[PDB]
Design an enzyme around this catalytic site. Structure first.
Site, mmCIF file in Angstrom:
data_model
loop_
_atom_site.group_PDB
_atom_site.id
_atom_site.type_symbol
_atom_site.label_atom_id
_atom_site.label_comp_id
_atom_site.label_asym_id
_atom_site.label_seq_id
_atom_site.Cartn_x
_atom_site.Cartn_y
_atom_site.Cartn_z
ATOM 1 N N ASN D 166 0.923 -1.196 -0.024
ATOM 2 C CA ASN D 166 -0.011 0.012 -0.059
ATOM 3 C C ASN D 166 1.017 1.426 0.011
ATOM 4 O O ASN D 166 0.405 2.420 -0.337
ATOM 5 C CB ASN D 166 -1.192 -0.106 1.024
ATOM 6 N N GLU D 263 4.323 -4.955 12.251
ATOM 7 C CA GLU D 263 3.372 -3.774 12.205
ATOM 8 C C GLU D 263 2.236 -4.769 11.453
ATOM 9 O O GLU D 263 2.160 -4.367 10.004
ATOM 10 C CB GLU D 263 3.925 -2.590 11.246
ATOM 11 N N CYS D 297 -3.914 0.221 6.359
ATOM 12 C CA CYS D 297 -3.970 -0.600 7.629
ATOM 13 C C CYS D 297 -4.483 0.320 8.880
ATOM 14 O O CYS D 297 -5.276 -0.226 10.000
ATOM 15 C CB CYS D 297 -2.522 -0.981 7.939
ATOM 16 N N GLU D 477 7.751 2.183 14.652
ATOM 17 C CA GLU D 477 8.275 2.868 13.391
ATOM 18 C C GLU D 477 8.497 4.354 13.586
ATOM 19 O O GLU D 477 7.598 4.843 14.418
ATOM 20 C CB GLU D 477 7.478 2.619 12.060
#
Lengths: 503, 503, 503, 503
Positions: D166, D263, D297, D477
């Site tokens: 994505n 993640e 997400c 992150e």
């Protein structure tokens, strides 16, 4: 700026400044009318580079007001945002490294071999704090009974910097870098002897994209510097200079409760143990004493050598000091230029004079000089001096000379030197050359100074903090620690429920 | 100590101090010879609790020397080790919470309902910094070309604390706690009006297991406090008091380049928006104005209420202030004791007087008082006052009264009050009662004070920092931030290879 | 508890456990019905101290649910608040230091001289994290365009600890301490060989004032431990044990995405350079090999000695190892007890056996033993062994023995040993004895392990982090670092104005 | 590179890739021989942009070895030094922002209006970690009895990144940035559907001045990604993708005890209270659901609206969703491109289908599409769908769709939604639109997700950390927190005196 671009063809004794040296509101001020002025000199030739017209209350105030305005805008930008501008300001200094360095030499007197480092040091400092701005933060703590608190790291307001002359461009950068990274506006006053390169930096920040007025510059001396400390709109004073002055600055700052930081002088000790490695030790003593004509505040001007090696050490070091090339500073093979001014030269010599009058034994240097080159006839040169036969009570061992004069003294035991090393009102730096893991750290831990070099000397990385102990000052420059001197924490406590009142 | 154990049966007007109040070398000094003295009073009765003999250079110096010795030992202990002793010192204060609280009341005047909190606050502060000592650390950074640097977080030396009288036991604890956690030795001087409870703390630390002399106490006033600031062996001064004095303290500290922190006064604003919840808002205004006879530096003595709710707010708050019980401080239902001294009472009243002479409109209180109980006839009582019809230019709105006097003022728009709120030379605290998420933080962010309460007030947790902005001082007490004011960083750079010398 | 109070008169071979060893819901569970059981032994005598009934899904689940409940309450308390309870829990362990230590010896086998340290280590860990709880915090950052963000440091939920047997009480404390300081609830499973002292700690926390159910204990082995890793309400698994198992634990934890930390084993190298100080070096090798019957994961079982000193070193160290007193562990002059179990003893001996079958040369020890004292006839004793003539390829140099067996190997140059030292899949600890400042740090920097001792060994302070590299695990125990393994950060971003939408 | 320069004239349906997509050893590998391949598509047209040849063990291994070599060199550079290279790598991406963005669109499908942000986001991340490298440090603690300890923050070794489709360029940057800032070497595998832009970044780092081989790229899918997790020379795996896979990745990583961070996905809740500001709330719901074709997400795909405002909210939001322009992604007025692949489109539609089969009520969108423009006839378009009449038990409310499908559900009380919001195995993000200061933070504090937006949504600043809770993963992150996932701390304890041995 154009003067900076003219540098490639510039040479000792040829240049002459003609721009205006006051800068605020994003431009150079013409400073009209007579207004008593001062001659700034080219140390290598004794020539008058230009005159400098000092600022009075009127001017200063405008500088401040200028900063004041810009702050309002700049303080509203986020770290990530102030970061962008700064990164560019560096990239620029980077691209004009040489030309700027060259000009730095002409007014200051240090050799370009050094000057170049001075500038890389300048842009690194900026590039460092820039990358540090997005990091600026406060805390969030959970309190008893549902309530929570949080701190905001906020800028101080308008920060005033009062500079020194041994590292004009570098020190100004060292004060602006963190100041701006934190959201403050700056107004600094370069040393009247070296007013030129400062304003350059200022212009560059503007060129980088800083809000008009964020970085201002006012020239002048005592009177001026005072106005800065008394001005009601200056939230912080960052001073670098002699102890005597640091003391006055702190007093004036009190009348307003201004934040203050002082990076005063020092008479730092260098310790040489018999188990060291002579060559590196010789280099240390050397590097710790003769950079920038020995006009460096962190110099280990009080060298203690363990008796057993006193001879062989003292031999090689006298040879090496004599092998130093004094001459045209703009020459790459030159290792020492002229001092900053005539008065300073006479002062440094006066010290050597009284040294021998107190028993000191001059092994080399210590007298005026006159380079072969005819254009350097009027420069402020003297030859690097190495004293021998010194006592802890001699004026030369106790006072900061601020000239190329090394005092060597013998010692026998560790406990001995420590008591002697720390026996000073100063506490800026110190060094130790030894090979035993335990002695190293142990001596390090015991010296009472803000910085301690182990098997090297005069290194000043941006990654770590730098400042004094005792009367050498307080506060830090470089390293993360510094951000706390250019920011303050507001505590915001937030009640999630109802008030517990006793009424 | 025995006096502390006698407290269970102690009652207003019955006690009398007889111990010696100077403490150093780990014991109470007899302070012989005439030596002019000062009477310390019991605020609730006007009775003389005892005399206090002030320290001169001779005494002070001994105090310092005492600390000096102990420091040498205490600074050698590791955090984990200094932690143990401190944890015990707390556990003790914990176990004598009441008796100490009760005695605190007798000399200070605040109600025991408050006093008790004051002490829990004291032992928590210690227990907090104690658990924080093992955390004390510096950094280790890897530098270019194999070399590496590291910082050591070291104690300052001998720290001098100059206390205030509104929170005797609490403030002393707030200065010693971090000081010791960091390895320093302490010498503090309680307010001559409240010299008794201080020495108690001192003894306790010794009892906990602190090296003899680490915590000393000298009684006296201006003269004494000065000696502390001038003494060459005091590395730091931590002052709490009026702005005028803070200014003098900072000046004297300059002569030696001492580290300084000032928690001066304030004239903090409380903001009430029409969308708030009146009850909680009333409580805030209340809690923000009448704790400890309103002799609290962080009080929101300048209350801004948004015009629409001015009436209903001002109604309920005048009722509530009148419903405050003034009387015997050692009584649990009492909500306000007598002020600290006659002079203070006259000063506070003088303010209310001139208030109405400037147009102020007294809605309640503001006059001397005389409790029913016969023993409180000579106490220093007055009734909590609520002004109305105030102007930003009235002396009462601008000056720190330091008495139970609330100034209510109307306002219309947000931008309006902010400019008015921040329009002061002070900047200690501030508060805001509103319900809109954005306005809350936004107003918080815009107030120029060191602390901002949101929908509550007067909460002072140990987990977070506390200090002023502008002329309300600098430096912090409580929270992690503080450790940086009682420690310094030495930079140790270590060369792993050979020296790079230019000679 | 009463068993703990009976200890003063307890002696080797006399005690016998009779309490129930499962604990949850704040009390010891009777665990009724047959339910296959396992005998726990007294290492010094071979006697059966009691049986241990392992937990199945049913039990485990109750444990968890119990923790789950308590967490809800405990997680709501503030750090300052969770701190109080913990400080007491320590103070208690402190006051029962001995009795607990004594009992620890009976089931574990290590000498009380060691056991005592083990426990002080336990209460210090708690007292440390306790003082660290009020420090737990997140950040507050100012973002572009007025918006701001802030992180909350939140507890994980229910933390499961799977312990090992070499330090029963200490390791359990090392997992609970940080876990609770962070607001989590704990459920741990002691090693089936040492189930007794664990539950003690548990009771103490309850006695300290912990919410009922916060600390639970389930006995059992593989089956049980698995249930913990699979249980859907356990947010984190903290494992300590062999590499093989660590690997299985991590796999099972994956099915739920559980947070995991593994403190696996190691085959750590000790480096001795010719410029060291033999005595200290001998002590190191010694201390690095024979504490707790050499059943210590961080032991420098692979000793590299620089060829020149190989002889004199190897001489004094063989003498010293022979001078170790093996016998009654509850005796103060004893320096080594029996191993944990018969199987372990046979395994350790089997290693020495194959060592000589591969060329190893046994200089001393390495065989079963039988103490004079008649009651120790059935103990699991063997004599500390020192191998000589080892090769990097021998099974004994490569495998973790986990018994008192030292492998000495010669080496010539620095570059040589480093490649050899780091040539392992392990990476827990390592050590170096030398005198040159540069070699020390340099070797330190180059070893690939999580911990490196310089001129000492086996020290494990609470102030610093501890964990492995490579396949020795990841995550840390002790030190500040750990708190990040028992807490997570939620990012809360707050828009102060309007949304910027692309729709 | 040239393909990147060709972009200014590039347009939908015109481009075609022809370079080689595997990159290691500092150059693109020809990948010869048949070797089964996969077609990568242009989402807006359905055209085949090129084939992609996946890497097997042989290739992968070379990639790793390549990284391995470079690491040795790069890890030796100081932070300040790794900083310089990175700052340049950004400056480059900065200067090719557009062209890269444009190409990103062609393979990914998102609109350039978004794509552009994606890239600025990429270079900011690098520029951020770059400025953060000189900050990387460890601690120095003073221990009991003269000894001291210190930690070194060291790189992990070779870090493997397994990306998602994505945000191709952005996510790769987000993994390399911190990885390199910390001294690690990187080997990443882009999603087989989007292999092109990744290698670009790689080349840029090399062009910036990174040691040859530091950043490598291997194309492929499951098989390949596995090889990375099993390879013995990869110290860390950083995964981003579905929960199911995250679970497999963690299992394989266990066989070697690799450091892991996941993640994973999410089904995050957006909470709308009746006291909010509809417009901003509408925007939120909108921004939280349809960026990058709703294939994000962190999307608040489960929108809870407080019953009272359900109507007016649901009205304006259905209108707005219908007003979204679907078409050529390379057009600035376009607000939604085609999904990533046919299979994904069919999957997303299949969800809407079963939604109504479970009672869902489609208010708009939810069906295939066919843009007017003839070249977009074969694109993977569908119209943004808004469900109504949803139940907490419907498959669409529970499963992560990963398509433009919004599920609106009514709610009555705060306690109600919280239990419902947190009632999921997921825990990535969440949001809340309200106006009450208390409810905001309170709800924030109570949601069980790693991120919580307040009155906005989908903002992802680099200054703050980002990761999941529960089964949405662990690790972070962005933000400072991350550096701890790409570095480890070695504890070095140094004895200043003699060893304390029990033998």
């Amino acid at each position: 700026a154009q003067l900076v671009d003219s540098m490639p063809s510039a040479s000792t004794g040829s240049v002459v400044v003609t721009d205006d040296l006051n800068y605020w509101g994003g431009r150079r001020i013409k400073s009209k009318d007579g207004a008593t002025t001062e001659p700034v000199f080219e140390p290598a030739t004794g020539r008058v580079l230009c005159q400098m017209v000092p600022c009075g209350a009127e001017e200063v105030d405008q500088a401040v007001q200028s900063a004041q305005a810009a702050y309002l805008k700049w303080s509203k930008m986020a770290g990530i945002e102030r970061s962008r501008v700064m990164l560019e300001a560096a990239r620029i200094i980077r691209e004009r490294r040489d030309n700027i360095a060259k000009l730095e030499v002409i007014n200051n007197g240090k050799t370009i071999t050094e000057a170049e480092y001075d500038i890389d040091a300048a842009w690194q400092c900026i590039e460092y704090y820039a990358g540090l701005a997005p990091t600026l933060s406060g805390q969030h703590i959970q309190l008893p009974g549902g309530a929570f608190a949080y701190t905001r790291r906020e800028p101080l307001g308008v920060c005033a910097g009062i500079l020194a002359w041994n590292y004009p461009f570098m020190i100004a950068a060292w004060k602006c870098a963190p100041a701006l990274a934190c959201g403050n506006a700056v107004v600094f006053k370069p040393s009247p002897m070296t007013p030129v390169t400062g304003v350059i930096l200022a212009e560059i920040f503007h060129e980088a994209g800083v809000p008009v007025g964020l970085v201002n510059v006012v020239q002048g001396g005592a009177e001026t510097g005072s106005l800065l400390c008394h001005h009601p709109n200056v939230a912080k004073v960052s001073f670098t200079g002699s102890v005597p002055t640091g003391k006055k600055v702190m007093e004036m700052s009190a009348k307003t409760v201004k934040h203050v930081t002082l990076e005063l002088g020092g008479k730092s000790p260098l310790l040489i143990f018999k188990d060291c490695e002579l060559e590196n030790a010789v280099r240390g003593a050397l590097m710790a004493n003769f950079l920038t004509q020995g006009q460096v505040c962190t110099n280990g001007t009080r060298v203690f050598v363990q008796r057993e090696i006193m001879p062989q050490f003292l031999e090689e070091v006298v040879k090496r000091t004599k092998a130093i090339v004094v001459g045209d500073p703009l020459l790459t093979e030159t290792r020492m230029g002229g001092l900053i001014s005539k008065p300073q030269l006479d002062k440094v010599l006066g010290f050597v004079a009284q040294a021998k009058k107190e028993g000191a034994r001059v092994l080399c240097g210590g007298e005026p000089l006159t380079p072969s080159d005819p254009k350097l006839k009027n420069g402020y040169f003297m030859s690097p001096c190495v004293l021998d036969n010194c006592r802890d009570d001699m004026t030369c061992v106790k006072e900061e000379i601020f000239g190329p004069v090394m005092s060597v003294l013998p010692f026998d035991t560790e406990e001995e030197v420590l008591q002697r090393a720390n026996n000073t009102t100063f506490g800026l730096a110190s060094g130790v050359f030894t090979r035993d893991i335990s002695r190293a750290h142990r001596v390090a831990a015991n010296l009472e100074a803000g910085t301690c070099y182990i098997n090297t000397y005069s290194i000043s990385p941006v990654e770590v903090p730098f400042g004094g102990y005792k009367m050498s000052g307080f506060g830090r420059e470089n390293g993360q620690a510094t951000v706390d001197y250019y920011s303050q924490l507001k505590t915001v406590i937030v009640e999630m429920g109802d008030v517990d009142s006793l009424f």
